[PDB]
UniProtKB/Swiss-Prot annotation, chain B:
Entry binding sites for Ca(2+) 1: Q2, D41, L75, N77, I79, V81
Domain called Peptidase S8: residue spans: 5-274
Domain of life (superkingdom): Bacteria
Protein name: Subtilisin BPN'
Organism name: Bacillus amyloliquefaciens (Bacillus velezensis)
UniProt GO cellular component terms: extracellular region
Catalytically driven reaction(s): Hydrolysis of proteins with broad specificity for peptide bonds, and a preference for a large uncharged residue in P1. Hydrolyzes peptide amides
Annotated gene: apr
UniProt-annotated binding residues for Ca(2+) 2: G169, Y171, V174
Active site per database record: D32 (charge relay system), H64 (charge relay system), S221 (charge relay system)
Use case: Used as a detergent protease. Sold under the name Alcalase by Novozymes.
Summary of subunit composition and partner proteins: Monomer.
Amino acid sequence: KTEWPELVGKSVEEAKKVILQDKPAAQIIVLPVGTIVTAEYRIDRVRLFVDRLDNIAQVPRVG
Amino acid sequence: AQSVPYGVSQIKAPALHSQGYTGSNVKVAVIDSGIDSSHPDLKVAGGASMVPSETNPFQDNNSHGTHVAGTVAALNNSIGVLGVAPSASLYAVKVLGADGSGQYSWIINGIEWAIANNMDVINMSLGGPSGSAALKAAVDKAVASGVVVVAAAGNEGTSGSSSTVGYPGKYPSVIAVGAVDSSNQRASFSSVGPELDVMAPGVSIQSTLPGNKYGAYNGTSMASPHVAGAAALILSKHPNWTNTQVRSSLENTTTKLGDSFYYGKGLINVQAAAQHHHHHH
Ligand SMILES: [Ca+2]
Ligand code: NA
């Protein structure tokens, strides 16, 4: 599993819990939706983009 | 002893170096997380930070901008790696904080700094899935002003028939760069779409890291600075060529790979780009 479309619209807390069940060594970083980010590919990372309510606003994916 | 990372050889940069051209006097802004100016294999000529809480552009608290900078311009000496354009005048334009993210306004402020400071080339190893009118206006302004603007295509892989190229790569004024490996195969993560322009090496790319280190990173972020460095080599051999001409020289001399949706025009070849007459190999 490398993408979690079912997490869009969930809280950031639930998303973290679910991703760590699937990928327990994941390096999770929470960032604001609508920012620009580095374009390097990190197999261990999952960025979580949240809206101003701290809900997931983009499909989480590995990279 | 110095090592030449495979991707510098793969794009044929050593052919320009043997002609005597290394990017001298070309100003390249690395619009990114900063550049560690204390690295002995980098020479940073100047810069500025647009990140409100990280005011020193010469401190890279992430590592990414230092790695990108080394692919553009790591020094030609007896240490570390060799950059594509090892004599380029390298500018650290910090618009991303330690966590690798920045606000659109910070990126635009860095593009505006680059225009005001007469940069010849901008590298943006960064992106997001949405544009903004203000971002499009900043990149279009830089190009109208004569700057070669290069960006990573993004690492969003495929999504059926949909484009997955991010912004600012996706804007027509920006050269969007995808990633291949040493066999010229597209990296599985490399974004795709009709906005993909050219490819460059983006798998297991050795470059400079903060605190006098080196390491291999992956990404369209790694591919983009091969093209920004190639633009600086081309301008050092043809200092009057416009950004329009530099862009066309790179596009018109790629080694064609697969379908353009996945590979754009193919792998850049800076030896062929820097000739007067251009064709694909
Ligand atoms: Ca060196
Ligand atoms: Na583009």
